[PDB]
Paper text:
Neuromedin U receptors (NMURs), including NMUR1 and NMUR2, are a group of Gq/11-coupled G protein-coupled receptors (GPCRs). These receptors are stimulated by two endogenous neuropeptides, neuromedin U and S (NMU and NMS) with similar binding affinities.
The cryo-EM structures of NMUR2-Gq-scFv16 complexes bound to NMU and NMS were determined at 2.8 Å and 3.2 Å, respectively. We use the structure of the NMU-NMUR2-Gq complex, which shows a higher resolution relative to the NMS-bound one, to analyze the peptide binding mode for NMUR2. At the bottom region of the orthosteric peptide-binding pocket, polar receptor residues form an extensive polar interaction network with R6U and amidated N7U. On the opposite orientation of N7U, R6U was fastened mainly through polar interactions by S3127.38 and E1022.61, the latter further making intramolecular polar contacts with Y521.39 and Y3177.43. Another polar network links R4U to E1052.64, N109ECL1, and K1223.28, locking NMU with TM2, TM3, and ECL1. Apart from the polar interaction networks, F1U, L2U, and F3U are engaged in hydrophobic contacts with the upper part of the TMD pocket. Since the complexes of NMUR1 and NMUR2 with NMU or NMS share highly overlaid overall conformations, we applied the structure of the NMU-NMUR2-Gq complex to consider the activation mechanisms of NMURs. Structural comparison of this complex with the antagonist-bound ghrelin receptor supports the contention that these NMURs are in the active state, featured by the pronounced outward displacement of the cytoplasmic end of TM6 and concomitantly inward shift of TM7. The structure of the NMU-NMUR2-Gq complex was applied to characterize the interface between NMURs and Gq heterotrimer in the detergent micellular environment.
Residue numbers in the entry:
A (entry chain C): 18 to 25
B (entry chain B): 8 to 345
C (entry chain R): 42 to 196, 200 to 347
D (entry chain A): 5 to 55, 181 to 361
E (entry chain E): 1 to 119, 136 to 247
F (entry chain G): 5 to 58
The structure:
Amino acid sequence: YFLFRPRN
Amino acid sequence: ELDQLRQEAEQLKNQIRDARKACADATLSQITNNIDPVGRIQMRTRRTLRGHLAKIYAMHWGTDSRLLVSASQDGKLIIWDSYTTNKVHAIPLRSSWVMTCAYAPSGNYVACGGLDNICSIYNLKTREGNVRVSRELAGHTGYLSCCRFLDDNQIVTSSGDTTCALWDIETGQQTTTFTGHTGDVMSLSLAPDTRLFVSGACDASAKLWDVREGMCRQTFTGHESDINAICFFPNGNAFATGSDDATCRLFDLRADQELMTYSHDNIICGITSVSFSKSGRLLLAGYDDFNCNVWDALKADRAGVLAGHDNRVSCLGVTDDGMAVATGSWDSFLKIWN
Amino acid sequence: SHFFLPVSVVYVPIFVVGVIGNVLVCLVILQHQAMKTPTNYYLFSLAVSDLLVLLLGMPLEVYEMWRNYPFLFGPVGCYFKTALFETVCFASILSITTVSVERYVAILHPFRAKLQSTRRRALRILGIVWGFSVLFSLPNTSIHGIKFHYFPNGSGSATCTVIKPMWIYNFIIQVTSFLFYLLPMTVISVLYYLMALRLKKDKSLEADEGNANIQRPCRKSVNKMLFVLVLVFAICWAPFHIDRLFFSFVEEWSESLAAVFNLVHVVSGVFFYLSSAVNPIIYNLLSRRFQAAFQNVISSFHK
Amino acid sequence: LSAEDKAAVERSKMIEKQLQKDKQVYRRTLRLLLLGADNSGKSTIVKQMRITSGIFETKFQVDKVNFHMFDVGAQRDERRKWIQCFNDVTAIIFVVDSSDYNRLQEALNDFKSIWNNRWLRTISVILFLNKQDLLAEKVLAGKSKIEDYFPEFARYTTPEDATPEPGEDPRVTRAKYFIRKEFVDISTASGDGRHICYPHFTCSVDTENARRIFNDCKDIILQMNLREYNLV
Amino acid sequence: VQLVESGGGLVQPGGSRKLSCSASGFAFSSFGMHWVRQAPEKGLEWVAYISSGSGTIYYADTVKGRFTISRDDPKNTLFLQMTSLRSEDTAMYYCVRSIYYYGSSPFDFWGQGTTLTVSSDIVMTQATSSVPVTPGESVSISCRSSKSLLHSNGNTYLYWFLQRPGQSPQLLIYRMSNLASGVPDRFSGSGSGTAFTLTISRLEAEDVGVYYCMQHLEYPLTFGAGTKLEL
Amino acid sequence: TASIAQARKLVEQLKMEANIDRIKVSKAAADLMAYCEAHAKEDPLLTPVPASEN
């Protein structure tokens, strides 16, 4: 389980 | 008659050629071979004058070499305080296409002219405080190329009509008209004694004139080009020329021939302005290639380059005290080098 | 850390190309004043924006692909990263839009363009652009903080994440997508379509004898490049807002949803950074003015 | 900095303010150079643009853009020097008398010298083939025939794409298009795309000449914008 | 060239009055203009300044707030609106033009003046209030300053003025050694960084009057007490 | 009339130019070199002056 984060 | 006169003229030309050749005991490059080289001359831009809107066609120094007039095709003359970079005066012209300007040696007047064919003499010392036209000297049937003051009342002019003229400013009339070149006269330089002056024209010749009466005492005839620039050696015994064959040539008024040719194979661009340093060792030439080159007037070697301009170097002049070199260019900037 | 190698492999070419291109632009525009014209101010601002995007995002992205949880800076750095990234992205978008408007006026109102074109106007418009860029960055910055997986139980992990509630973030992202991708794309497309129409016509279309002698030689390249510019903007910036909206919309991440989002993020990153890589190529390079200026500058270096 | 030095700086800045006010006018005015032999109707164009002095600044305005038109009226035959001043002009308006066939070759060589000049190379030429009424009368009357001066007129067909006006006699059209073709042929060689020619058949009575210059300048500025804005 | 001041007359203490000066015969806009007062039977005293284009305004500490100086370039008129006039403000007020560029001659023209009747700075000392002399003699009027007027740029900012009986002051020497237009070469300036001397080399009947020194280094412009020459 | 008059003017001008006295180029070069040597010290461009004297 891995999540990139929305390039804010 | 005509063919006899032509034969006489050709024989006289051969006589002049023979006399000049007979005077060629040695070359300047031989005599100056022993003298120490000038070394590299790394002049740097000490001031940049940002005032003009359009191309800077001409500039001239004051005799108290701090003030500096410059002309541009936008119809302005700006009197510059070189030390402070301040603008002393901005003179609106009635003709946009000013090709030459001059500062009177007294500093009281500034002349300018161009395609208008009118030498407009401006009074800087009016009691009204504004700068005002004193005279609109009219008489040339062609564009003015150069103007130089002899005094507050005498201004010599060169024009595309092939003739130079000496003007009485008060009268507004030509005191003497100098019998024409074959082509447009492009450059003038008054001798330091102000009795002689030399003129360069679009025919590949430069003519030494006597101001007292208009006789071309000597004609110098080596060039493959139009003489865009002319300047007297500081002692008045020699004068340098510049032309669109990319060569400057140093002529001697007493040997009546070219002493030295300043040329380098990498220079294909024409020469737009020429001026000496106070001592005469440095000959500064402006070029269409946006550069100004410093030449060892004796050794003929290139001593350095002034590289700051981004368009045709248009005019350059060395202060009477030799402190600084001004260089105007079509980029609308004057850069002072020292 | 699944994607680090294959994604870095494709990022590095984009990074090198974009850095070289934008540095070339920033050099040439300054190296000689014949290039210092008002439109080159807009293009220089775009080059700066794209260079900043590359340098500020590309390294941190590969770093977080190397290891995600240990985020580095601490609160001040989260605000700086978020705000600067948003500002440079909005700045690039608005520079594209202002270049488009200036070209439109230059083609359909050439006299107006020559008369209004001044460095004062250029710098004023750049100021407005960057002002909006920093201003509209603040709403998205304010909702960003540090999340922790630290507990008082006794038995770091400080990722830079949206801390304030997700619905406001979704509102922010939707409004930003509308104002900074949909309206800009509409403006750019309409303006360049009208430019292509005007460059097809001549003499108000009264040229009964034809215009192929003058118009077509330019039109042939001009219409292709206009299509290229509009498509580059749309295709490269769509994935960016796509990934932002994707994260903002979902309420609880299933593992399959997370995997598909990660793939979307990788693809979006490659397209988005290809944006900043190709912008100098299509806006400054591949143009005769810049080619001539570049040759002149290289010759000046070749002294 | 002394009080007087500060006041001098203030005077300098007030000169700079005036210079900016003049820079606005300088940028907002389009410069045009009007060339043409004494046979050309350039003087009549100047007089009908009724919206020893070597330069004649003529000013007129069309659709709220200001044009300054310069005629060098009292200067010597040679121009290789004073023509250098006129780079950075929007266009050169070259007027040639299309009727006097004897002078057409001289006009062609003058156009060549203008087109191939080192400094003008970036400057477009608006080419007014003037006195078309006289050309019509002359070719209709047949008293003088272009073939005698230009042999290739015997083998020149009217271009199939031409768009003659109503009432055009075929010979008038053919002659005028041959003259235009000669000038355009001089223009297309060595053009290099940086500058282009805009031929116009005109009569000095025609009031539309101002619109012709307006449209041609609009196109010239459009190309300059294409290059300046990196579109090409 | 003319400067005709108007607005004088009787004003009760604490009142307000506006002086005016109609400039004609010169480019009013290009000249910075000065108001200089002269208390009855006393020396000159600087009042106010307004530069070309009104970009710079200075006032004497004696008049700050009370007086406001303004100009109307299209009407070629200079104004000095006075408020809360004190008895010490009674004086003849001269409108004075000045133009500032390299080689300019500030204070080169003074208006005829208008009379107003009511009801750390550099100090200049003139050694003598009066000097008896007859034509043909040489007179060396002397001056001294509390601070060296020789600025780093090489200018010694000392001005000299001659006020003949009933006339407004006339500029003689603007920098300590530069002679004004229309002034005979008989007048010759000289000085050191702190002590100065005006030599009238061959006196004439036209030379009798009060000679005032002035400094233009710092802004409160301070005149000397004035050295009178008497036949 | 005018053509042969111009030719006569040219002939006379060439005559007066031919009659001038001319010194050897060696002496002229020596004189220019002497002037350059004599005034070398007074040329700020040839020998840069200290920064305090600009």
